[PDB]
Amino acid sequence: GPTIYHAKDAVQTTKPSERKPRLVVFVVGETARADHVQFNGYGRETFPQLAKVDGLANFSQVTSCGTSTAYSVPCMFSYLGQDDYDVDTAKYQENVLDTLDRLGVGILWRDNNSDSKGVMDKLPATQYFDYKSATNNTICNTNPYNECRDVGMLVGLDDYVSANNGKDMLIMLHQMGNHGPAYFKRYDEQFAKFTPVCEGNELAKCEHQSLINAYDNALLATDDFIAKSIDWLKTHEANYDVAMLYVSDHGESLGENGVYLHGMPNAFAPKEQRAVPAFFWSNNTTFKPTASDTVLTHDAITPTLLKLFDVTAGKVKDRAAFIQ
Ligand SMILES: [Zn+2]
Ligand SMILES: [Zn+2]
């Protein structure tokens, strides 16, 4: 049958013709655990750069829709919520990006992870780019693995802003982040702060502290990427109200009870695979975060993205969001 719509009643209550246009980067994070962020109680400073950003909000009580990228990513952009979510048919539902595009918001998705897991499939091919290879990513030569880096997704974004100047814009950066098993490959060597590091692709053969250290070094690289994304947004704050939303797609098991990696069914998965960090920053009070300890899930993402662009829609109007 046809695409199943959920927000045909969506309306944008203020337009970029009547107020300052809005430019948002949504970092779609990867494999990051809430309990390895110092803001949430971790006894190591894994986010030192974000710790120094004025106006950076951290959300300490967020849990994911699921435990893998294929499962969680479509749910993050869904109208259905985790309880009604069906991974098999998510591709055939109107999602929040479809709504925003229909209402005139520019949508761009750069992917240094895998792909959009069906989220971008109805939208024009010109709105999605594979940043896992040097065909598009200019930052793949900073490490001996030739692995393309998340910071490469920021290069050239000014051309996109110029081509859509004066419109509202939402840019998804799907980062490699902390995906394993080979955490040691996920960061350039200026982030090799904690030692010893487990150097291999079979984590069950790692000594425990060396496994943690490799994982935490990868978090330092993500701290840096998010900080640089905020720096990029700041270069546009004269002409746009700017904001950055970060949410990880799921956590990671690090050997607790013999469990590694992620992907367990929600009915069985340990809390480590579900408790995820989330951050929000904006340049001014056009947006206001909700309380940092609000109990939230991935169901909060769709209403947040709508609120960022002053869009209302009946399907999610009583949902808690990351902003007021
Ligand atoms: Zn995975
Ligand atoms: Zn993932």
Numbering used by the authors: 217 to 540
In the authors' words:
MCR-1 catalyses the transfer of positively charged phosphoethanolamine onto lipid A, which is subsequently incorporated into the outer membrane, reducing the net negative charge and preventing colistin binding.
To understand MCR diversity, we have solved the crystal structure of the MCR-2 catalytic domain (residues 217–538; MCR-2CD), which is 87% identical to MCR-1CD. Although the Zn1 coordination distances are shorter in MCR-2 compared with MCR-1, there are no other structural differences around the Zn1 site, further underlying the importance of Zn1 to enzyme function. Solvent-accessible loops are largely unperturbed, although loop 411–424 shifts ∼4 Å between MCR-15GRR and MCR-2CD. A single residue (Ser330) is a Ramachandran plot outlier, with φ and ψ values of −165.9 and −82.4°, respectively. This residue is sterically strained by forming a hydrogen bond to Asn329, and is also a Ramachadran plot outlier in all other MCR-1 structures. The MCR-2CD structure also indicates that amino-acid mutations on the periplasmic facing surface of MCR-1 are well tolerated. The physiological relevance of the second zinc site has yet to be established, although it has now been observed in three MCR crystal structures. Resolving this issue will require accurate and detailed mechanistic and computational studies of phosphoethanolamine transfer by the MCR family of enzymes, the latter of which will be greatly facilitated by the exceptionally high resolution of the current structure.
